[PDB]
Amino acid sequence: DASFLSSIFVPVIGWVVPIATFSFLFLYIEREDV
Amino acid sequence: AKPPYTFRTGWALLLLAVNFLVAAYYFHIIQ
Amino acid sequence: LGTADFLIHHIHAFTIHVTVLILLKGVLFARSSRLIPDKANLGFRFPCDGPGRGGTCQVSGWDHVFLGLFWMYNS
Amino acid sequence: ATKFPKFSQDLAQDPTTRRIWYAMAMGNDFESHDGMTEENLYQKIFATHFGHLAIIFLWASSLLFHVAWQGNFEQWIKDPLHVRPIAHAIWDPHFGKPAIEAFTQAGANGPVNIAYSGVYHWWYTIGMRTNTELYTGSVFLLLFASLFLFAGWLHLQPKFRPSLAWFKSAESRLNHHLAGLFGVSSLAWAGHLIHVAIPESRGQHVGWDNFLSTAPHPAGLQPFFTGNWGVYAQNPDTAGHIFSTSQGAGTAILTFLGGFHPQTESLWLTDMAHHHLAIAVLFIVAGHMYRTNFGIGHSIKEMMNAKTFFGKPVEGPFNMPHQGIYDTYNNSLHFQLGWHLACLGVVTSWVAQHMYSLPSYAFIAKDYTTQAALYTHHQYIAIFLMVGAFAHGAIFLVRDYDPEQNKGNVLERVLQHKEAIISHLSWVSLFLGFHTLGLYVHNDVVVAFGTPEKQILIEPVFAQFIQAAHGKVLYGLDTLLSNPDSVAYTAYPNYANVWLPGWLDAINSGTNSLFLTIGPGDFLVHHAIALGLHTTTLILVKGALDARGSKLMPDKKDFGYAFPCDGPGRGGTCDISAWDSFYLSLFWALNTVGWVTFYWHWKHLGIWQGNVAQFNENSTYLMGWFRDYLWANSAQLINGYNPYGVNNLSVWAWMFLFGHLVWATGFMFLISWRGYWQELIETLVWAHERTPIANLVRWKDKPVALSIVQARVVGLAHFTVGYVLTYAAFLIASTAGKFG
Amino acid sequence: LGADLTPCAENPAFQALAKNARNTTADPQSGQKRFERYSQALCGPEGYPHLIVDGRLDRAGDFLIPSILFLYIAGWIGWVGRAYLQAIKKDSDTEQKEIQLDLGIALPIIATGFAWPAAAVKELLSGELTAKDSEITVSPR
Amino acid sequence: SHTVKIYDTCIGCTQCVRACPTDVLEMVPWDGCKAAQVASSPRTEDCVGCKRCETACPTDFLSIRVYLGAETTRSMGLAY
Amino acid sequence: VQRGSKVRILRPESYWFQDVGTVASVDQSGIKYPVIVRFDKVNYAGINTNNFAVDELIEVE
Amino acid sequence: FVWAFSLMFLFSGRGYWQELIESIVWAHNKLKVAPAIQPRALSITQGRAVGVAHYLLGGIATTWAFFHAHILSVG
Amino acid sequence: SSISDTQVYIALVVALIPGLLAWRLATELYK
Amino acid sequence: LSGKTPLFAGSTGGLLTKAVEEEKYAITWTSPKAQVFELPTGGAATMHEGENLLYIARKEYGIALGGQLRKFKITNYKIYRILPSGETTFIHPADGVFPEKVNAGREKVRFNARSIGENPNPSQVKFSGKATYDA
Ligand code: CLA
Ligand code: CLA
Ligand code: CLA
Ligand code: CLA
Ligand code: CLA
Ligand SMILES: CC1=C(/C=C/C(C)=C/C=C/C(C)=C/C=C/C=C(C)/C=C/C=C(C)/C=C/C2=C(C)CCCC2(C)C)C(C)(C)CCC1
Ligand SMILES: CC1=C(/C=C/C(C)=C/C=C/C(C)=C\C=C\C=C(C)\C=C\C=C(C)\C=C\C2=C(C)CCCC2(C)C)C(C)(C)CCC1
Ligand SMILES: CC1=C(C/C=C(\C)CCC[C@H](C)CCC[C@H](C)CCCC(C)C)C(=O)c2ccccc2C1=O
Ligand code: SF4
Ligand code: SF4
């Protein structure tokens, strides 16, 4: 009955992890601090 | 150096003799 | 003529326009670009102008004919 | 510097997109970072190994957790020859209802993927029987990866960073790796086999809750310490033993039978236990050879530099000068990395060659698609490791090699005549290629003109001799083990070749893949394989030995390993760097492995159907390969989806087309070169800066075309991803549409 | 020998192929004479003659005779080319004589080239076959 | 920038200075050759890296070398 | 080193390293590479002459 | 075959080929068979020209043989 | 058929441990 | 700077946003007569009789333009670097003499007092700031 975990993890791994990862890395590679 | 080349032709002759031994087992000369 | 014919005629439009892009780019930029100003001193047919300016391989008009032969083939 | 990447002040001052791309490509080259010392180099490498090792153990935990939770392992134990193993479940919101119906398979409840890696056969062989055991294995591997992650964190803290002398203390690491990491691990694996896997195969449960009580053999350690070791070999499993049941079951734990278990068609477990015990004793003894803190043992440095042979002066070991090779190995991380990649690539090919012909896991010899997937997987991994072996030989020669500390030794002698080596690899390459191609074209024309009896067909008489010396009676050669009157056959003095009846029973079955019958189709393909090996070696060896300099660029070591060219002058110098031989040789390595896996697959696909005659009659000319292997076997693949519907091969059809697309996208980066794209991007910059509302935004980093080396990288990456995915889609789908 | 090599004259698949033989030339019995000549080879179960190249004298015509024949003709060609390049390196413009052949130099050389093994052995023993490793160019190590 | 080096096998034939499209090179006085002049590269910040100087150099195995390095706006040849 | 002599190049970076060329002229002004050698082989730049030092030469007569 | 053989010329450059010719010219200098017309790898432009000529020749001859053998059989 | 839900949740909570340890190793390797 | 901008109807090839933000260049020359030349950005323009002033995106544009002003026998062309601070520096020729000619007062820069096969090995200079070409 733990098959509901896929409807959380696959949209997380497909949208939330890419958006957060790319947003951090975009702001990081364009920053002039570090 | 060594114009007879005795160390490197000893091992070349040994490898070729092992080759001839395998071929002697191939052509049914031995056994 | 139907949807498959619509699709393939736009494939044709695409592949001709890309071939025209390559060949027209080679004709309009045969003498100069922003990158290499004295390109017409180097000739029509020359390989490059060295690895500098980032790398300037296949800038000649000949090289555009080269690259456009493949897209002509594709089309 | 003051901006990403922080390891390169030269890249961080680049105002273009090239900053980002070369940051991504140089992040793992620790040596080229700003202010790298040698000690900090080895400390960082040592902690990243713990990280990578944790990545491996988290991967294995994924396999176990997903089979334990989503697979059908407990349903697969009951009938391994018929139930399809489930890899994992599919949650895709993109599927329509007929795709969900097509992928609801293997008796599962929703859409699932069929497993092709063979881990059910492996886990079943080693004693696992329930989903709970797979689950505790995966949780264990999570904690084990946690232990390596903490250890890698810990050895970066300032009191725990190991000194540079600790990293170069080679003889201690050899004693520990040979004795510990090989021998204790092998001895413990013999212990698992004997305590767990042999009783589970004989029907008796042994777990963590009863292994301190149940003895593996009824006699105990009493025969071991008394030296009556043959007690452990008495009463083996019979020829009517059924796996994981009690009928036909013996009590032996250490046999030397040979051949295969007749039900599961794989090697005997007591033979493997005895293998790992004897292997462990060998490696533990070998781990006492070298000198450490305790006075006894060998000094490898002294063994290199030695100049006397019982008072007679020699150049060195085998009269060959090895002075400075100890330092050349021990001081250069690229020498060690290229050397280990070579050894590991040989071992990966050797693993690949044995797991189809001498399989170990129960019933995997009848799971044909996993046999194809495993052999093709390890042969691709092997060719990549060999390309990297030579690539780090070339990086070693550029960066780490000084001729003054290798003065007069064997490596300098190799460098002194590199033209002879390269021209002889060229001779062997042309010699194989001309004749193997012309032979195929002879046979192909002659079959085309309707007279196929004029084919040049050559028996592989020497490899058929080797099969005959191994005891295969089919050729009728009456040599070493096929001759029952031979001294090899009877083993005359001792007569202790106790493996020989089981080995001869397996090799003369004709129902397995143990030394398959070969003929003239096997001959020509082995010479094509020799061609591919020799040409890939030619490119790699030539790039290594010319990495320092050549006549066209005498100062190539001043530019390093990877640089675009030396410009248009001196005739033109495209692909002159040592990196460019890596580039050019990945094509020949992929080609070579494509020839070997096409050959493996088409021969076995003949055997698996009962039609060896198709291969034996049609592989002597190239249209037989084309028609009967590429055309004939791709039929069911490209019908994975069609205008009428969809079946379970539609992922592999979609992947097949995908791989064609990635492979062909490569050719753009390989054929069109940089200055075209740079002139095109300049007009895109004009168009963006002259367009209204799009004027409101623009770039912080200036758009440029990819660099010359970058484009070679991207094109080769596309080429090989498309190569791998196209072949893996075809291999899986063509085998599994025929056999499941 | 290996993998079901019967003689061609006894193989039923060879006898079945010989009945449907195609004519190679304009001779109406090229196929029959082809199978009569091939009847003494060894034969797979598909009917096709397999060749044995291990060097036994029962099968010398499979590979040993063509080996001697090729190596003689190839040594002829290579020795004549070496003799021509060595003969023209003294005649005051060598590169022009490589695209425009001196027939008065080349044709006596191609007539002389029948005895290339004796000439090659006399070239070998006198130290004239090879140049020294210090005499010819190399690249920095 | 890139780095343009000059070695003492220079014969001062001025051809690299004529080949340069960005005025990196110049001829300075010397006593090491018959022409009594070397090449020198004071403006290497303007080096695009195109290696016309090395193509122009006549001495066998060049008296001038360009070592490509950190890329700037000038060395990438960008007009934007 | 005399004009007309057949020298052999000892310069390892040279195209004609361990090859035989002919001396064209030798300067006496004390420059670093005084000897001009002409070759029958052109290099990759199409040039068959180069300045050499005396230490980079051995005479072949 | 001719199509695939084009890709050796398209994907490579001439520094590799000139450096391989150096070792082969060594083996000819060793046996006194080096030609006075010195062997050079093809120029960058010629390598591109040969590559596109074989790519076009191979691809068009493939479609030629395909079209001929299908339409002489079904039509 | 499969494993229970509680075992899945225990495996996820245990996988929080090498995730935190991998974050700490990756940030320490960065400096 | 002084000079008349040459007569042409404009192009898309001219100065972009780099001119107002980091760097701009200019070439001046004096011509004996009005005559047609070719712009580095593409196109035909007419130079004026007398002094001229044409702005360019890169230094290489002015060196290509001054290379084709040699063909009209105009050899007094000067190139200026122009920063957005208004700071104009005179770059070519920098000495006043064209660099093909030797002028005194010029010092050697980046000369190596050795031949090029006498550079150190990269392993001999490893883990330090120096390269093999550096002195
Ligand atoms: C007995 C003591 C001992 C042990 C067990 C180890 C173990 C290890 N050391 Mg270590 N080391 C030791 C002492 C020891 N060391 C000492 C004393 C020193 C100092 C002189 C070092 C210095 C040292 C350094 C500097 C490094 C290591 C590294 C490693 C790791 C090697 C990589 C690996 O996992 O290979 C695993 C190897 C095996 C399992 C055996 C070989 C595998 C073969 C080739 C495969 C074939 C077997 C079989 C057929 C396959 C079955 C497959 C099937 C199950 C699927 C490993 C964890 C490296 C590392 O990763 O550190 C984090 C590293 O860089 N060691
Ligand atoms: C034990 C294994 C091992 C180790 C430790 C190293 C270590 C190293 N190698 Mg190396 N190498 C290896 C194996 C290894 N290699 C193998 C097997 C090969 C043959 C392929 C090579 C070939 C090689 C070359 C040619 C070079 C290195 C370089 C390097 C150094 C830097 C790597 C770097 O920063 O690249 C950064 C890494 C990346 C940017 C990752 C590239 C990503 C690739 C293309 C995979 C992409 C696949 C893609 C995601 C698939 C998606 C498909 C999907 C759509 C389905 C580093 C010292 C380089 C160096 O600096 O040496 C001086 C260098 O020039 N190696
Ligand atoms: C089908 C494609 C193909 C073919 C045939 C070859 C053939 C060859 N490559 Mg390869 N190559 C290819 C693709 C191919 N390559 C690709 C895609 C790459 C990646 C860029 C490379 C990269 C590469 C490198 C980097 C190297 C080679 C090498 C070689 C040679 C290996 C020696 C050999 O087998 O001799 C056999 C010769 C042949 C098979 C070709 C001759 C064909 C017939 C016999 C000639 C008859 C022609 C006929 C008379 C018609 C006349 C034409 C007229 C009518 C117009 C050979 C010339 C190596 C080399 O030079 O070795 C010395 C080497 O270093 N190649
Ligand atoms: C299969 C191989 C292949 C492909 C895909 C391309 C693709 C392209 N080439 Mg090309 N090229 C190739 C081979 C190929 N080439 C070869 C072999 C050569 C050698 C001669 C060249 C030489 C060449 C030149 C000289 C030129 C091009 C141009 C172009 C572009 C055409 C215009 C355009 O944008 O179309 C649109 C793009 C496509 C149709 C590509 C497919 C896009 C997919 C269908 C959509 C994306 C899917 C999805 C949303 C992605 C999500 C991913 C996920 C991670 C979320 C395009 C990027 C021209 C160009 O740049 O003009 C603008 C141009 O001038 N190419
Ligand atoms: C005078 C003719 C001649 C001779 C004696 C040799 C001799 C040799 N060549 Mg060769 N070669 C030649 C011409 C010749 N070459 C030409 C014209 C080419 C350009 C195609 C090459 C290209 C070549 C390569 C690429 C390689 C050799 C290699 C070799 C060596 C091994 C044998 C071999 O691989 O042959 C193979 C040679 C060929 C396939 C070339 C074809 C030969 C032509 C068709 C015959 C030439 C005859 C001549 C034109 C007639 C003039 C006669 C006069 C009366 C006018 C050997 C020293 C190999 C080596 O270094 O190994 C150590 C090697 O890798 N050769
Ligand atoms: C059959 C048999 C046998 C035998 C075996 C053998 C003897 C084997 C061997 C094998 C071998 C013998 C192998 C080989 C391999 C090797 C390789 C593969 C190598 C390579 C390497 C590399 C890659 C290198 C690199 C480099 C360079 C290039 C430079 C410098 C650095 C280096 C060194 C790193 C016996 C008796 C047991 C028994 C019976 C069976
Ligand atoms: C018997 C037999 C066999 C075997 C074989 C063998 C194994 C051999 C080997 C051999 C060898 C291993 C050889 C080697 C050699 C080497 C060398 C060293 C060479 C050299 C050469 C030369 C030098 C040449 C010269 C010339 C001439 C003479 C003429 C022309 C020109 C030239 C120059 C080319 C077989 C099975 C196949 C078949 C059957 C029989
Ligand atoms: C393979 C390859 C070569 C090697 C090819 C060469 C050197 C030319 C091919 C050899 C010619 C065909 C040999 C001709 C020799 C004689 C004319 C043969 C005479 C024989 C008689 C019987 C006629 C390049 O030079 C090259 C250059 C630039 C980019 C890519 C490549 C490239 O891919
Ligand atoms: S790689 Fe490009 S820039 Fe370099 S020599 Fe070749 S064509 Fe020219
Ligand atoms: S690389 Fe180009 S810009 Fe630099 S000095 Fe040479 S010719 Fe001038």
Structural class of chain I: mainly alpha
State the name of the first-level CATH class of chain J.
Alpha Beta
Rg of Cα set of chain I: 14 Å
Helix content of chain I: over 70%
Strand content of chain J: 25-35%
Q: Widest sheet of chain J: strand order?
A: 4-1-5-6
Q: Figure out the total of helices of chain J.
A: 2
Sheet bearing the most strands of chain J, described?
A: 4 strands, antiparallel
Biggest interface pair, residues each?
F-J, 41 and 37 residues
Q: How many β-strands of chain I, per DSSP?
A: 0
Major sheet size, sense and barrel closure of chain I: none
Oligomer: part of a larger assembly
Q: So what's the overall shape of chain J?
A: elongated
Order of helices and strands of chain I: H
Q: Write the H/E string of chain J, N to C.
A: HEEEEHEEE
CATH T-level fold name of chain J: Photosystem 1 Reaction Centre Subunit Ii, Chain: D
Number of helical runs of chain I?
A: 1
Measured as a percent range, the helix fraction of chain J is 10-25%
Bound molecules: chlorophyll A, beta-carotene, phylloquinone, iron/sulfur cluster
Query: What is the distance, rounded to the nearest whole angstrom, between the alpha carbons of the first and last residues of chain I?
Result: 47 Å
Q: Supply the helix-strand structural class of chain J.
A: alpha+beta
What are the main properties of this structure?
part of a larger assembly, 10 chains, B: 31 residues, mainly alpha, E: 141 residues, Helicase, Ruva Protein, domain 3, three-stranded antiparallel sheet, 3 strands, 50% helix, elongated, binds beta-carotene, binds phylloquinone, binds iron/sulfur cluster, photosystem i (chain J), Photosystem I reaction center subunit II (chain J), membrane (chain J)
Could you walk me through the main structural features you see in this protein, from its secondary elements to its overall organization?
It is classed as photosynthesis. This is part of a larger assembly, with 10 protein chains of 9 kinds. Chain F contains 2 helices and 4 strands, in the order βαββαβ. With 80 residues, chain F is an alpha+beta fold. Chain I is 84% helix and 0% strand. Chain I contains 1 helix and no strands. Chain I has one helix at residues 5-30. Chain J is 10% helix and 26% strand. Chain J has one domain (1-135): Photosystem I PsaD, reaction center subunit II (Photosystem 1 Reaction Centre Subunit Ii, Chain: D), CATH 3.30.1470.10. Chain J is of the alpha+beta class and 135 residues long. In chain J, the strands form 2 sheets. In chain J, strands 4-1-5-6 form a 4-stranded antiparallel beta sheet. Chain J has a two-stranded antiparallel sheet with strand order 2-3. Chain F binds chain J through residues 3-9, 14, 17-18, 20-23, 25-30, 36-38, 40-44, 46, 48, 61-63, 65, 67, 73-74, 77-80, and chain J through 16-18, 22-23, 57-61, 63-64, 79, 91-95, 99-102, 104, 106-117, 131, 133. β5 of chain D pairs parallel with β3 of chain E. Residues 335, 338-339, 342, 346, 389-390, 393, 396-397, 544 of chain D line the site of one beta-carotene (BCR).
